[PDB]
């Protein structure tokens, strides 16, 4: 199976309250492993996965430094942007960034990513070549000139094709038994009347990893793609996820309907009916 | 001189004495570094700063301390100077970007001694071109010898008719120990300046050898009989001789 | 990070020298080369992070990431190229702080067209005071022995450039603080 590393940055300005807040979170696949908040008691990188706790003091010192240096830089960035858009200090503003590398079900690098946003809108993004930038508006074109002059695309390519890959591989081995082995869903079907002769058949899926899951209803052999209430995949809060798919069926006609589950941890796609 | 200024440039202190070196910048770079250079080794990191009041240890941090109170300055303190801290010290600055170079300062020659009374200025002499050399080559070489100085903190420059010259000038890369098999032996330094036979044979030509010595001063208590070996210039000269 | 490069290299002007640098580095995030003249600060030459040959004038920089190998290739070698050459590596290991190797001393030898080795005795200006020996005009491949008996002092060879005549030459110096001393056996 494929694996990917991602870091997520949020830089929020908050004038009238004080200096901007910087939050950084690292993910391997759907597992968060590190967090860094500028507002925490003593700003340092904190472990969020068990397998990363084996990394030495040298690892946490360096991460700490790197994030502390970004604290000042994204604060600086927030002034620069407030300068390009000519924005007053009357408003709170947000810089978002996400970068990282994907690996194939083979271990080999598939591609790299580096995207940034301002006030929730695309701002600047690294291209597929890792040599150039796409700017969204003319404010980002000033950023583009700054980054070209300083050859920043170089730094990123050295990371995405280099450090990003090597470190991801290290993390994948260090915690292979939670990062490379997949948790299958715990599936069942509930029956619940909502009238005097038409009832709900809800297909539950609980305790699975990663979040990738397909839940579908079928009658006679045809997908009920129309008449299905389908919730968003939701975190259980214990490194597992949840989802269900529900359909309203005419009473005494339950056993025409079948739920279908597709998920990495399942050796084969599962078929379920309601069990009287 | 890329905005980077080191002070002091030359310093001679007694062992067990606080010493501080100053690194100053005018470019606002977030990262500053203190390295040392020792024979056999390359540059070795002492301490570095990644922002105001943000500092960390390098490879050789023992006996060293640093403060980054402001952006302009990165200060290096040796609380109790040991003879092992005798070295050339380099400070550097950078933007922090992994694809940008470090900018290094001009350096600092720091000597730490058990006994300041071992400090001696150089005696400078000038040796005039040989006649055998003149007839054989139509070329004349003067030799300048600085001797008896301690430590090796000297700068040798040639002057002809009141003007510094570099053409035909050659000076030893490194001074020589006068007593090689002896701790804290005094040093010597040679240099040569080759001019034409006719240039040397002109009596209106003044050939002066200058040696800049960096020793004690301006405090350094001195309770000895011989003159205080302060920072000083010693010269020796020769005039052109007619055939 | 163990950065590893040769101690000392030797070539003649106009030639081509290759300076090897190998690093044992996982966490590698770029290689730097610096030129350092004796008694002077190191100056920037090249930044290398991608595999390939990168030309910047008469200096080339090569990197092979897989094998932890890098060389700096100097062509059309000049007298001013005489200097130390620094290999610097940024790794995850410490932090991405440029860590330096021992450096490589490069000596560039002048081409002596017509060597005419000779020893002369030069006299002091003052006064009742006396002399020194000069070994000069020898080819660049002549080794200069150091002192013996300890009462004698020999300086290394050193190249001077008589720019006007376009004339380069080597020279060593011998002097003694004893009466019994002649220049004919000084460089024996």
């Amino acid at each position: 199976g494929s694996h990917s590393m991602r870091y997520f940055y949020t830089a929020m300005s908050r004038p009238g309250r004080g200096e901007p807040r910087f939050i950084a979170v690292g993910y391997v696949d759907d597992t968060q492993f590190v967090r860094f908040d500028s507002d925490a008691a003593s700003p340092r990188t904190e472990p969020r996965a068990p397998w990363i706790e084996q990394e030495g003091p040298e690892y946490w010192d360096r991460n700490t430094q790197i994030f502390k240096t970004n604290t000042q830089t994204y604060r600086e960035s927030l002034r620069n942007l407030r300068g390009y858009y000519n924005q007053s200090e009357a408003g709170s503003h947000i810089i978002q960034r996400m970068y990282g590398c994907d690996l194939g079900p083979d271990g080999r690098l598939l591609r790299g990513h580096d995207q940034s946003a301002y006030d929730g809108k695309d701002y600047i993004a690294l291209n597929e070549d890792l040599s150039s930038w796409t700017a969204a508006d003319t404010a980002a074109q000033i950023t583009q000139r700054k980054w070209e002059a300083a050859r920043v695309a170089e730094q990123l390519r050295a990371y995405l094709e280099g450090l990003c890959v090597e470190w991801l591989r290290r993390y994948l081995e260090n915690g292979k038994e939670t990062l490379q082995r997949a948790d299958p869903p715990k599936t069942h079907v509930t029956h619940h009347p909502v009238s005097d002769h038409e009832a709900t058949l809800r297909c539950w899926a609980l305790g699975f990893y990663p979040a990738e899951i397909t839940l579908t209803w079928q009658r006679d052999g045809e997908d009920q793609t129309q008449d299905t209430e389908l919730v968003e995949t939701r975190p259980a809060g214990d490194r597992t996820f949840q989802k269900w798919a529900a359909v309203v069926v005419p009473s005494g006609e339950e056993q025409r309907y079948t739920c279908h589950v597709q998920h990495e941890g399942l050796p084969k796609p599962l078929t379920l009916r309601w069990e009287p | 001189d890329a905005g980077i200024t080191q002070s002091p440039r030359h310093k001679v202190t007694e062992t067990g004495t606080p010493v501080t070196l100053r690194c100053h910048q005018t470019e606002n770079h977030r990262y500053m570094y203190w390295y040392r250079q020792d024979p056999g080794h390359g540059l070795r990191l002492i301490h570095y700063s990644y922002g105001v009041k943000d500092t960390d240890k390098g490879e050789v941090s023992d006996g060293y301390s640093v403060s980054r109170s402001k952006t302009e300055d990165f200060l290096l303190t040796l609380e109790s100077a040991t003879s092992s801290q005798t070295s050339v010290y380099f400070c550097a600055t950078g933007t922090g970007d992994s694809n940008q170079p470090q900018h290094f300062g001009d350096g600092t020659r720091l000597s730490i001694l058990e006994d300041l009374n071992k400090v001696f200025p150089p005696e400078v002499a000038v040796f005039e071109p040989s006649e055998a050399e003149i007839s054989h080559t139509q070329k004349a070489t003067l030799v300048c010898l600085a001797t008896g100085f301690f430590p090796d903190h000297v700068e040798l420059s040639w002057w002809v008719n009141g003007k510094e010259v570099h053409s035909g000038v050659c000076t030893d890369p490194q001074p020589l120990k006068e007593q090689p098999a002896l701790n804290d032996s005094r040093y010597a330094l040679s240099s040569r300046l080759r001019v034409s036979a006719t240039f040397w044979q002109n009596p209106r030509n003044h050939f002066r050898c200058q040696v800049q010595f960096y020793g004690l001063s301006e405090n350094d208590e001195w309770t000895q009989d011989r003159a205080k070996p302060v920072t000083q210039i010693v010269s020796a000269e020769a005039w052109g001789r007619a055939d | 990070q163990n950065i590893d490069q040769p101690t000392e290299m030797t070539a003649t002007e106009g030639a081509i020298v290759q300076i090897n640098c190998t690093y044992q580095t996982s966490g590698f995030n770029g290689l730097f080369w610096y030129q350092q003249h004796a008694g002077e600060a190191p100056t920037f030459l090249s930044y290398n992070v991608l595999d390939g040959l990168e030309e910047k004038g008469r200096f080339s920089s090569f990197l092979s990431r897989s094998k932890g190998y890098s060389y700096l290739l100097l062509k059309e070698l000049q007298m001013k190229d005489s200097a130390s050459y620094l290999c610097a590596v940024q790794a995850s290991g410490g932090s991405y702080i440029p860590t330096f190797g021992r450096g490589t001393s490069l000596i560039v030898h002048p081409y002596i067209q017509n060597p005419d080795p000779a020893v002369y005795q030069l006299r002091d200006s003052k006064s009742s005071d006396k002399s020194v020996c000069l070994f000069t005009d020898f080819d660049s491949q002549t080794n200069v022995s150091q002192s013996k008996d300890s009462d004698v002092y020999i300086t290394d060879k050193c190249v001077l450039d008589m720019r006007s005549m376009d004339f380069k030459s080597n020279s060593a110096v011998a002097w003694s603080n004893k009466s019994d001393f002649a220049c004919a056996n000084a460089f024996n």
Binding site: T73 | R30, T95 | -
Partner: peptide, 11 residues
């Protein structure tokens, strides 16, 4: 392992 940057990487 995060992306190292520093000044000049500012927006």
């Amino acid at each position: 392992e995060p992306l190292p940057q520093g000044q000049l990487t500012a927006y």
